[PDB]
Amino acid sequence: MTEYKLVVVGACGVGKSALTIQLIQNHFVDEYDPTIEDSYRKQVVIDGETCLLDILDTAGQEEYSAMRDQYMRTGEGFLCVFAINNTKSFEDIHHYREQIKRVKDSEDVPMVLVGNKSDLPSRTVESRQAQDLARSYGIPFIETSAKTRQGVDDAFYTLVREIRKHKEK
Amino acid sequence: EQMRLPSADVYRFAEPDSEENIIFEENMQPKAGIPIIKAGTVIKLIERLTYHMYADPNFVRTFLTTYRSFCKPQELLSLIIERFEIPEPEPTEASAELKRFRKEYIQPVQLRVLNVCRHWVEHHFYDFERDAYLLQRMEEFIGTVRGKAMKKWVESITKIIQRKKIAITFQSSPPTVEWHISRPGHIETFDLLTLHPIEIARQLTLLESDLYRAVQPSELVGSVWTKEDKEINSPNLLKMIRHTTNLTLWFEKCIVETENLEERVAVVSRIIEILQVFQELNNFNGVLEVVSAMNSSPVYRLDHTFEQIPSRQKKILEEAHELSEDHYKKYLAKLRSINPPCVPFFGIYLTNILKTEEGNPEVLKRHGKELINFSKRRKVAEITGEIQQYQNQPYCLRVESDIKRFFENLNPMGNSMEKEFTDYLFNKSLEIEPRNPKPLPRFPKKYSYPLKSPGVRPSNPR
Ligand SMILES: NCc1nn(-c2ccccc2)c2c1CCC2
């Protein structure tokens, strides 16, 4: 069974946690202990191919800025997450991408841009803007709503599809 | 017979337990045989915080550490005062039921409230430093209290209040301080290779231990270090992280600014020796600040440097890196199995607190009624308790005030911004060891003293 090591990156306040938690936690239980091992590993069927997702989310460790390379180095694929109500988190995306390319020593690292919605304030990043940024990088854009679970599967599954397409070559 | 309390009309804590106001986890409290509260209304939580049948130290601690997400300090004080002021049930037909009720309900409950006040003022005094009126109200409530059984606790609370408004030596002998090329007092020559690697590790372990010990639960609960007021609410945690970051960066800088290959090998080798001592001291923050530097993108790519690292030190570095692999699996197992003194890596705790708070609802609903999710808070308090268990035991090492100062005032970035500085480190990496197929240049030596390490074993006995 193939295992995909995925890494979630983004500014603090983005609800990066929520994304990963909503993926892993069962579709109708709101309960989560991050101390156990099932917290970050999920078995899933994507395009008829059963596989194992291992998701690294270091939410809360953003101030350990010199550890980003260490964490990034562990991943084959990356979710770059911003919040649609935080323009600064959107602008920081450029930096995360550059740092990932540098760590993986490659121009063509499997990657997806994710814009997450939760609660107030209202939107400051229109989806068009994010579609344009994603197109300039040549990566997919997925918009998600943590609280309703909309787009969460699509975000992670699209990243796996990106890794498969990269490994063919 | 049960008791016969007042009606809920005249006293809100008499309301019976039901599925709509309090619910429990299936298992029972360790050591104590008390039920574990999963959720309840704030009234029911306060009832159980001050419960008549038994004391609940664990619930009291957990509650006072975590209540502020669901109840403001002013509201808590109002509720415990309300709890204290118990009316007597309707006239005795005049005292069988009244002396019983006074002794087995009123008095126990009143003592439990006083216990809460004591613990609040002793262990969470910051609520009072931040809200002077809250302290005013506590002091005028404590003056209200009249009973002779109460006298001793009232005295004690007043004594704690007074102490709290007011503004290391060893068990046996610490080991002899180690010097290499730099002599004592000559702070101008201090550097990575001139100080003794043992003493670098010891003095960094002392700094990082004090930094770890200063971080309080108030800086962590509610994930406050990630919010816009983080500098206001989590100053000690942030200082601690910035130190760690500074040192990782200083290690990177020492490496890539040593342009001569032989010298750079000596630098990396010396940094691995410091790691070995961190590992001996169980300074896992130290261990990780070295591991982070070595995995950094300017350092990791230096294949020519790594090639010349003696195999023993390669193995040391590889073992340390493996602590971090598979979501800190080996680090976690190692930490569980050692006793103080140590310096944990804080990042794991931060992530676990955040995810606990984010991944669980603030309330649960039952029959249309909103109950505070207390189990969520318990989990956070478990993490802050695990943090606190490594904060009590100091290291048996002498401070060297010059070496200490040297590491406190380290500033590898200087006046530069982060992006600018890390780009400089990376461009320096590219200069000293270009990408294939470009050949390796030579660079002149910068160090006019010997590069040989004194090693990692103490010079003198005991
Ligand atoms: N690619 C060569 C290389 N590998 N590593 C390394 C090995 C194990 C763990 C962490 C880092 C280092 C280099 C240059 C100095 C550090």
Cis peptide bond prior to B458, omega within 30° of 0: no
Q: What is the CA radius of gyration of chain A?
A: 15
Mind telling me how many Å the CA of A100 is from chain B's nearest CA?
Answer: 10
Method for this entry: X-ray
Tell me the residue type at B121.
Answer: V
Residue in the structure block whose two tokens are 């990780």: B288
Q: Determine, for residues A60 and B426 on separate chains, whether the beta-carbon distance falls below 8 Å.
A: no
Task: Please check whether residue A31 touches B, CB under 8 A.
Answer: yes
For residue B265, being part of any structural domain is answered with yes
Residue B109: give the domain boundaries: 4-165+347-389
CB of B102 within 6 A of ligand 1: the answer is no
Residues B313 and B397 in one domain: yes
In sequence order, what DSSP letters do the residues of B14-67 get, joined into one string? GSPP-TTTEEEEEEE-TTT-PEEEEEE-HHHHHHHHT-SS---HHHHHHHHHHG
For residue B55, being part of any structural domain is answered with yes
Residues B204 and B333 in one domain: yes
Resolution (in Å) of the shown entry? 2.5
Task: Please check whether residue A40 touches B, CB under 8 A.
Answer: yes
Residues B354 and B400 in one domain: no
Closest CA to B4 of B102, B136, B135: B102
Would you give the DSSP letter of residue A150? B
Residues B136 and B202 in one domain: no
Domain boundary among B337, B360, B389: B389
For residue B11, being part of any structural domain is answered with yes
As a whole number of angstroms, the distance between CA B315 and CA B245 comes to 24
Collect contacts of B183-186 with beta carbons under 8 A, ≥24 apart.
Answer: B184/B402, B185/B402
User: Residues in chain B, how many?
Assistant: 462
CATH number of the CATH domain containing B370? 1.20.870.10
Contacts of A34 in chain B (CB under 8 A): 351-352, 355-356, 359
Domains of chain A: which residue ranges? 1-169
As a whole number of angstroms, the distance between CA A73 and CA B113 comes to 53
CB of B321 within 6 A of ligand 1: the answer is yes
Residues B237 and B109 in one domain: no
Mind telling me how many Å the CA of A45 is from chain B's nearest CA?
Answer: 23
As a whole number of angstroms, the distance between CA B143 and CA B154 comes to 8
User: Which of B225, B296, B361 comes nearest A69 by C-beta?
Assistant: B296
As a whole number of angstroms, the distance between CA B68 and CA B89 comes to 33
Would you give the DSSP letter of residue B335? H
Strands of B134-181 (E only): list them.
Answer: none
Do the strands A77-83 and B35-40 form a parallel or antiparallel pair, or are they unpaired? Answer: unpaired
| Contact between residue B237 and residue B354 where contact means Cβ atoms under 8 Å apart | no
Residues B157 and B216 in one domain: no
Residues B322 and B373 in one domain: no
For B320-357, b/e burial (b = at least 16 CB within 10 A) is bbebbeebbeebeebbeeeeebbbbbbbbbbbbbbbbb
List the strands of the sheet with A49-57, edge to edge.
A41-46, A49-57, A2-10, A77-83, A111-117, A141-145
Closest CA to A46 of A84, A75, A77, A82: A77
For the domain A1-169, what is the CATH code? 3.40.50.300
Residue in the structure block whose two tokens are 């003794």: B196
Give backbone dihedrals phi and psi of B24, rounded to 5 degrees, phi first.
-125, 150
Contacts of A29 in chain B (CB under 8 A): none
Q: Please name the residues in contact with B333: beta carbons below 8 A apart, sequence gap of 6 or more.
A: none
Q: Determine, for residues A59 and B252 on separate chains, whether the beta-carbon distance falls below 8 Å.
A: no
As a whole number of angstroms, the distance between CA A28 and CA B323 comes to 35
Contacts of A121 in chain B (CB under 8 A): none
Domain boundary among B335, B362, B389: B389
Residue B283, classed as helix, strand or coil, is strand
Residues B32 and B96 in one domain: yes
List the strands of the sheet with B369-373, edge to edge.
B22-28, B35-40, B369-373, B363-366
User: Which A residues 75-134 touch B at CB under 8 Å?
Assistant: 95, 99, 102-103, 105
Strands of chain A (E only): list them.
Answer: 2-10, 41-46, 49-57, 77-83, 111-117, 141-145
Contacts of B351 in chain A (CB under 8 A): 34, 57-61
How many domains, in total, are found in chain B?
2
End-to-end, the C-alpha distance of chain B in Å comes to 69
For residue B170, being part of any structural domain is answered with no
Residue A141, classed as helix, strand or coil, is strand
User: Which of A21, A25, A66 comes nearest B249 by C-beta?
Assistant: A66
As a whole number of angstroms, the distance between CA B78 and CA B73 comes to 9
For residue B44, being part of any structural domain is answered with yes
Cis peptide bond prior to B444, omega within 30° of 0: no
Residues B266 and B243 in one domain: yes
| Contact between residue B213 and residue B391 where contact means Cβ atoms under 8 Å apart | yes
Residues B440 and B367 in one domain: no
CA-nearest residue, atom 8 of ligand 1: B318
| Contact between residue B302 and residue B264 where contact means Cβ atoms under 8 Å apart | yes
Angle at B208 between CA B205 and CA B214, to 5 degrees: 140
Name the closest residue on chain B to residue A100, using Cα atoms. B297
As a whole number of angstroms, the distance between CA B102 and CA A21 comes to 50
CATH number of the CATH domain containing B279? 1.10.840.10
Atom of ligand 1 nearest to the CA of B268: 15
CB of B426 within 6 A of ligand 1: the answer is no
